[PDB]
Design a protein around this ligand. Structure first.
Ligand SMILES: Nc1ncnc2c1ncn2[C@@H]1O[C@H](COP(=O)(O)OP(=O)(O)OP(=O)(O)O)[C@@H](O)[C@H]1O
Lengths: 195, 380
C-alpha cells in the first residue's frame, strides 16, 4: 500500500496529508513509514472531508497518527505496509527527455527532483544511451552531453534518500521531473533502481 | 589580465608540488631575496654560510648542505642584479619513487613584487611565503544594521577596516502614567524609517564613489528586518542593490556583529574567482548549444586545432591526467606546456576547476581540455 505524504502538522496531535495512491487503509491498523521503517498507527481518517474508517485508493486523506517521532516527518515519505512495503533510493537509471532548456546537459548536471511528494536535490552522474525516436532504438556509446528535445537514459543520485519505485513498476512513484530554476528543464521516467 | 591568471596557476602548482618534495638531512635551501636588496651581498652571506657548514660534523649532512649552497650560488650567478620584483630560489635534491633522485633548481621572478627575506634549509622548501603572492584580492563592503547604530566597513583579502558608524536613540525608553502607545509608533515608526534612510545614504556615500561602485561585494547584516528593510527601500538602490552577495541575520551589531558578519560571509566571497570561470564555460557550452560551433574538446581536436588557425580561447582544467604521444597514469604536465607557450598558438588560455556546476561538467564530461575555436571546423 502507498500514501505519499504532502503535508505535516501538529494540530490535534500529529497529522499527515496525502493522496492514497495504492492499497486500502484501515482506521487504527498499523502502518510503517518511509524511508525509515518508522512505526505508526492510525488514529483517525478524514477522506475528502468527513471521516471514514476504511478508505481505499483515490481519496484525499488527512490522518491523525500515533508514532515514535512526530514532526520528524517530511513531505515526501510514503505511508506503506508493515510488512511488505516500499523500496527506497539514492541511486537509479532513467529515461529522460530534455524539454525547455534550452542549453545543455552533460554528466554532473544538477537540478531539483520532483517524483511523488518527495522533492529532493539531485544530480545526473553519467548518461547511458541516447534513445532515438526511431523504432524506440537505444543508442550505442555514451554521449558526453544531451541537447534539448533529445531523449536518453541516465544515472541519477539523490542528495540523501528517496522512497523510490520504478515507473515500469508502480508509476505513481515513477514519473518524475528535473526542475531547474522555474523552467521544467526535463521529463524523467525511472527504469532501473541501483541497487 | 588572463596572462596573470595563468601566473597564479603556475605559482599555485609550484607551491603545492614543493610540499610533495621532502629530501633527507638539511639539504633543502629556500631563498627569497626581496627587491632593492643586492645579490653580491646575499651571495656573500652564502659564502659566510658555506663557511660555517664547512664543519657541521655530520658527514652525510655536510657534503649535502654545501652541495646545495653551491647549487644556489651557482644559479645566483645567472643574475647580475636583483630583478625589479625580487628573486625566489629553491635548491636541493629530493627522493622520489623507487628511491631515485632529482637535483631540483628553481629560480624565478614573481608575477608581482615579492617582498620579504628568507634564507632557510630544512628538509623541505618553504613556500609559506610564496602563498602571500596569492592574495590578489578584491575590496568587499559590509553594512551592519542594528536596533541602535549601524556600521560600515570593508574586508579586502585580510584587512578588515571600519569606515564609519553613528549610533541612534530611537525613543526606546518608555513611560509609567503619561506616554501613549500612540507615542511609541508616531515617533518610533519614523525614527526607524528615517534611520534606514541615513543608512542607505551613508551606504551610497561610502561604496559608490564616482559614477560606479568601488567595492564589489556588499554583505548586509542586521537584527530582525533591518536588511529586508534596507534592501527593500525606495531609497537604497542603484548598483548597490545589485551587488549584494550574502545576507547575515545577526543578534549582535557594530564591530561585534561585523566580525560575525565576516565569519558567516566567508562562504560566498570565495566565489568571485569562481564567477569569471563560470562565465567562460558559458560561451563554450553555448557553442555546442548551437549548430555552428567553433567549439572543440578532447586532446586530439584541441591540439592540432591549436596548432593551426588558432583557437581563440583554450580551456583546460587545473589538474590533468595528460602529459607531454600524450599519456596519463599509463606507463611535462600538459597544462604546464600550455602555460609556457599558449600565447604563440593563438592567444590566451583559461584554466578552470572542477568546483562549479560547469567546472564539474567540463572536467566530468568533456575531458577538462578543449577550446572555443575561431571559425568552422571540418571533422573526421
Ligand atoms: N610590508 C608591505 N606590505 C605591503 N606592501 C608593501 C610593503 N612594503 C612595501 N610595499 C609596497 O606596496 C606595493 C604593494 O602593496 P599594495 O597594497 O599597493 O598592493 P597593490 O595595491 O595590489 O599594488 P601592486 O599590485 O602593485 O602590488 C609595492 O609596490 C611595495 O612597494
Amino acid at each position: 500500500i502507498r500514501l505519499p505524504i504532502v503535508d505535516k502538522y501538529k494540530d490535534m496531535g500529529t497529522v499527515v496529508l496525502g493522496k492514497l495512491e495504492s492499497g486500502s487503509i484501515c482506521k487504527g491498523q498499523q502502518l510503517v513509514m518511509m524511508p525509515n521503517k518508522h512505526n505508526v498507527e492510525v488514529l483517525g481518517i478524514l477522506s475528502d472531508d468527513v471521516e471514514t474508517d476504511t478508505v481505499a485508493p483515490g481519496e484525499n486523506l488527512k490522518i491523525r497518527l500515533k508514532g515514535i517521532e512526530e514532526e520528524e516527518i517530511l513531505p515526501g515519505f510514503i505511508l506503506c505496509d508493515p510488512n511488505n512495503l516500499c523500496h527506497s533510493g539514492r541511486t537509479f537509471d532513467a529515461q529522460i527527455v530534455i524539454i525547455e532548456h534550452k542549453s545543455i546537459i552533460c554528466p554532473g548536471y544538477n537540478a531539483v527532483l520532483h517524483i511523488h511528494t518527495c522533492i529532493e536535490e539531485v544530480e545526473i552522474t553519467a548518461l547511458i544511451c541516447l534513445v532515438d525516436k526511431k523504432s524506440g532504438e537505444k543508442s550505442k556509446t555514451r554521449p558526453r552531453f544531451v541537447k534539448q528535445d533529445q531523449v536518453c537514459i541516465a544515472r541519477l543520485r539523490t542528495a540523501g534518500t528517496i522512497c523510490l519505485e520504478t515507473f515500469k513498476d508502480f508509476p505513481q512513484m515513477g514519473r518524475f521531473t528535473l526542475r531547474d530554476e522555474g523552467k521544467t528543464i526535463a521529463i524523467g521516467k525511472v527504469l532501473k533502481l541501483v541497487p | 589580465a588572463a596572462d596573470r591568471n595563468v601566473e597564479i596557476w603556475k605559482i599555485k602548482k609550484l607551491i603545492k608540488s614543493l610540499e610533495a618534495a621532502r629530501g633527507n638531512g638539511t639539504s633543502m635551501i629556500s631563498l627569497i631575496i626581496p627587491p632593492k636588496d643586492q645579490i653580491s651581498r646575499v651571495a656573500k652571506m652564502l659564502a659566510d654560510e658555506f663557511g660555517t657548514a664547512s664543519n657541521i660534523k655530520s658527514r652525510v649532512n655536510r657534503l649535502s648542505v654545501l652541495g646545495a649552497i653551491t647549487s644556489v650560488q651557482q644559479r645566483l650567478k645567472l643574475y647580475n642584479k636583483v630583478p625589479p620584483n625580487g628573486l625566489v630560489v629553491y635548491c636541493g635534491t629530493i627522493v622520489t619513487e623507487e628511491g631515485k633522485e632529482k637535483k631540483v633548481n628553481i629560480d624565478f621572478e614573481p608575477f608581482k613584487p615579492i617582498n620579504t627575506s628568507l634564507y632557510l634549509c630544512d628538509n623541505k622548501f618553504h613556500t609559506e611565503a610564496l602563498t602571500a603572492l596569492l592574495s590578489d584580492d578584491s575590496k568587499f563592503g559590509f553594512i551592519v544594521i542594528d536596533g541602535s547604530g549601524a556600521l560600515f566597513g570593508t574586508l579586502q583579502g585580510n584587512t578588515r577596516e571600519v569606515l564609519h558608524k553613528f549610533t541612534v536613540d530611537l525613543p526606546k525608553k518608555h513611560g509609567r502614567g503619561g506616554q501613549s502607545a500612540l507615542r511609541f509608533a508616531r515617533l518610533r515608526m519614523e525614527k526607524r524609517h528615517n534611520y534606514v534612510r541615513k543608512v542607505a545614504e551613508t551606504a551610497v556615500q561610502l561604496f559608490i564613489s564616482g559614477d560606479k561602485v568601488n567595492v564589489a561585494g556588499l554583505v548586509l547584516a542586521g537584527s530582525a528586518d533591518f536588511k529586508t528593510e534596507l534592501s527593500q527601500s525606495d531609497m537604497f538602490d542603484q548598483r548597490l542593490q545589485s551587488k549584494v552577495l550574502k545576507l547575515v541575520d545577526i543578534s549582535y551589531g557594530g564591530e561585534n556583529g561585523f566580525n560575525q558578519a565576516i565569519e558567516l560571509s566567508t562562504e560566498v566571497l570565495s566565489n568571485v574567482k569562481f564567477i569569471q570561470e563560470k562565465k567562460l564555460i558559458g560561451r563554450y557550452f553555448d557553442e555546442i548549444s548551437q549548430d555552428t560551433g567553433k567549439y572543440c574538446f578532447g586532446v586530439e581536436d584541441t591540439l592540432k586545432a591549436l596548432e593551426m588557425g588558432a583557437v581563440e580561447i583554450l580551456i583546460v582544467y587545473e589538474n590533468l591526467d595528460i602529459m607531454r604521444l600524450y599519456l596519463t597514469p599509463e606507463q611535462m604536465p600538459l597544462l604546464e606546456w600550455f602555460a609556457n607557450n599558449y600565447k604563440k598558438f593563438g592567444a590566451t588560455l583559461e584554466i578552470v576547476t572542477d568546483k562549479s556546476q560547469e567546472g564539474s561538467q567540463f572536467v566530468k564530461g568533456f575531458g577538462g581540455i578543449g577550446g572555443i575555436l575561431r571559425y568552422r571546423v571540418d571533422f573526421q
